[PDB]
């Protein structure tokens, strides 16, 4: 009887905050993780304990065939699917693009860009009014370095996201008819440790001087304007953004 | 002074790529003609190029392939000796499909030629052109499309993406180098007459489309270059960051 929302990459940041709020909504989550088990875990045993209803499932989006066997656990646990975030996500070491080779290229799209579209793909193949689906949503998490381009720090990822961008205005053009809703979120400045996994943990405190709100934001603000893409509230809204950015 | 500037132009063989090269050998440019699959086109193309008077090389290289791409770029530091101009042109698409039928080695393959080859060949044009590494500055011009924007449903949104991609890399790339004499600015083009249709499944796309583009017609091939060589001319020499569209309105 609850909807349920596959978020992947929810063990940590931004997807265990999208997670935990879903949960006090009313929905059935599925919290996908990759490194970190018991973060995902801890979050499950959280929101069951509370008397919802979660499913932990380790699966790297990057790999056609963790997502299949991701989305079968989700046929067999709940046997239906109302919303996909795409939070997975991850950037490498500060660099200009004179340093980035094809190997990290390859493993930044892997997750960021053909992660998301690997998962909105078996998304659309439940969701779809095509193949035996209510309708539903699909919110895509992107980043304000589509718009910004990170230069010296990592183009690779600014156009991962950018990928991500035009992915959102397609997909939504192309679902719209069999009853799915595609948008995204483009965070600026969260705190999350993405920033340290980049190489510079105190990343928000050299910035937020320039930020027009003058903090950096939470995983918890990021949750909220995917929660309201996911819901029935934005019923008329296919193919747009939230920002979440302070400014930036 | 006598020397002509250094253009490479990749996927140069066939389509916009090749009349980029036509009208960059006409305009200052000793043109380097990077082809994968057609080089007898390539081949032609140079020797029509000596006939008018002109300088090209032709190079074999398959742009999402990092050693290929650094022999290519070994190529023209052995023939010329300097680099003025990239024009990141190679691009590719597949067969008209949903999003649901997309598999991770199409994505693969389509990233691979569209954005990691543009990526390397900038990498490899920035280790030279760049005023830190004893260049003179110069110029990128990558080569996206309407498609980052439009999104491309019901046929390659995989392919929107990768122009996307090129979008946010050419904002990123200007931002990064610009104090070090490289100007990084895009085209992005609608619907122009080559075989990329034909590729895609659908030689008769733009008959399909041409009575909603405002203009009314496809494009040339000769009308992208134009826009190719202005943002790599010295008169867009306040332009970074920047996009033309040449789309007729679409
Ligand atoms: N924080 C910011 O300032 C900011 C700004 C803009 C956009 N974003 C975007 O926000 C999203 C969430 O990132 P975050 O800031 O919360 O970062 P984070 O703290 O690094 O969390 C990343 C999450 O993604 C998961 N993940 C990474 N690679 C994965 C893979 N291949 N398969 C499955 N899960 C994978 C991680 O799971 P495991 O730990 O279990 O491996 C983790 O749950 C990402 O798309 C990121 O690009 C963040
Ligand atoms: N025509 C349009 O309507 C249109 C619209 C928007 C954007 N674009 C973009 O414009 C650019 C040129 O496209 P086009 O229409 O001229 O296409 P085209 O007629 O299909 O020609 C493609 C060219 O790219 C080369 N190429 C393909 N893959 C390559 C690789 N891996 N390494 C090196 N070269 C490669 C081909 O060389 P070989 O034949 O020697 O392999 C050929 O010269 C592409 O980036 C395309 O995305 C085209």
């Known amino acids: 009887m609850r909807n349920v929302m596959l978020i992947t990459g929810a063990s940590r940041g931004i997807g265990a905050a999208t997670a935990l709020l879903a949960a006090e909504r009313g929905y059935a989550v599925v919290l996908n993780y990759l490194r970190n088990r018991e973060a995902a875990e801890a979050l499950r045993q959280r929101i069951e304990r509370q008397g919802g209803e979660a499913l932990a499932v380790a699966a790297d989006v990057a790999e056609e065939g963790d997502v299949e066997r991701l989305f079968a656990s989700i046929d067999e646990r709940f046997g239906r699917l109302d919303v996909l975030v795409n939070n997975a996500g991850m950037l490498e070491a500060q660099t200009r693009l004179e340093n980035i080779d094809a190997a990290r290229l390859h493993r930044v799209f892997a997750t960021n860009v053909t992660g998301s579209f690997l998962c909105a793909r078996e ?25 910004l381009g990170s230069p010296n720090e990592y183009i690779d990822y600014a156009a991962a996201k950018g990928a991500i961008d035009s992915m959102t205005i397609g997909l939504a053009r192309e ?27 105190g990343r928000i405190e050299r ?9 950096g934001g939470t995983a918890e603000e990021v949750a909220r304007a995917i929660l309201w893409l996911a819901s029935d509230e934005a019923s008329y809204s296919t193919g747009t953004f939230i920002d979440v950015s302070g400014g930036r």
């Open 207 to 215: 910035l937020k001087g320039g930020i027009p709100l003058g903090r």
């Open 123 to 147: 998304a659309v193949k439940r969701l779809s009014t095509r193949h035996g689906g209510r309708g539903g949503s699909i919110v895509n998490v992107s980043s304000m370095a589509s718009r």
């Open 175 to 201: 679902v719209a008819a069999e009853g799915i809703r595609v948008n995204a979120v483009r965070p600026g400045l969260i705190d999350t440790e993405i920033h340290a996994s980049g190489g510079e943990p």
